[PDB]
């Protein structure tokens, strides 16, 4: 029943984290070993002595020694028979309508072992990272549990492969976006297949770039490869039959990092102008909308789609303005939805790394995100709800904790800690927000744990107020009908009664102001003190 499971992964990536939660919270024992030289590999399997080895995420062969002695199951983001190291890249380039994930045995030939479990699913037209993080991740969880059942039963035999194919590593020539020859659909497919790594190569404004995060543009028209407009640092680029937005780019050099396009293109954008669209405007054609505000049934819904959940200083202020617009609206509740792939991951570490002074940009970013939290907290006459459709970590978790209610989809993974970014003290009113939910003893325990927890475990400990839904869309529906019932009851007014009283009294405003002050002083030491752990850890996070 209580198996001992050793993870071999290249990195402790999102799928490895999700599996870790699913098995850990089922009373199993999981050791994670980030694949090293095959020697530490053999030696660590010796020392740890597992019942079962999972490889959620490998980029090299497991030593024949190890898996001939321990049952070794490999995750493959393809249907049974699909072999190769870029399964999803190829599935998307080839326009596959149906795809799947396979759990197969380790063997001497790459991806040729017998199958222990698989799932199939209809393929969305979407970024690779998002297929991986939703359909692939969910399927892999089902496979592993099934294999765990088949294993503890001891009497299971895997299905040898039959029909099978090999797709080699994909070269950049196949990904290259050629603006004069490629229609919008072809550019979406190329960028989708390279998002978020390695990027689709291209030439923009004479500069050689990698493209990331593409959105079709249905209104603006021009010459293929022309930069039509700017919009919140994205650029709109003419294609063969229309236009496409690209929010993020990377120079094709070694030391450079993904940044907003306007920061990569920089001074080359002299001519082009901004083409704004408020989050509350209504628009009939497909365009790029970073933040979206929509009112349904007396509720204000704020969508914000910050690439990779990273919140730049500037994006914090765009969000704060949409919150201020909502608080002046005929709505009883205000729901922050993030995006379908992330709720939030706190400060944009890439825009911090890129700034002249990362400490100063770190100072701007933490104050801006604190200004968002403060605005949420000081909403005495309205209900506020955090809706975690996707994962969240570091400052993004505590952004959500400032809302009256925090709901999350099933499968959401949380990292309520700064153990990966140099032990930042954190802010976002966590000294107020966190103990009001779990007490100072547990809250500090939460922040000391570098391992993730599911939205399920977070609910159990009282960190959040409810988990439900299997998909983003389901979660959205159930969340709406749950908030809908509450503001249509006498409980809603008896709740604003208390909240109006406390959150306008001077003893509360000064309480929370002393919290923001105490946190920023610790964070100021983190950004400028002698101990440079935070800057060291940011450097490696951003260049991996
Ligand atoms: C939260 C976290 C544990 C999730 O782990 P995970 O499931 O393995 O997800 P990943 O790190 O692989 O995220 C995928 C992408 O999102 C990016 N990303 C996530 N959070 C980011 C952030 N705050 N800033 C910039 N980029 C971020 C990652 O760089 C990664 O980039 P890539 O796809 O180009 O390789 C992890 O992403 C993390 O440590 N983020 C940093 C958050 C932070 O410290 N913010 C500053 C304090 S508020």
Author numbering: -1 to 542
Q: Which lines from the publication concern this structure?
A:
There are many basic amino acid residues around the windows and inside of the cavity, which make a “basic patch”, some of which are involved in hydrogen bonding interactions with CoA. We prepared and determined the crystal structures of variants in which mutations were introduced at amino acid residues interacting with CoA to elucidate physiological roles of these residues.
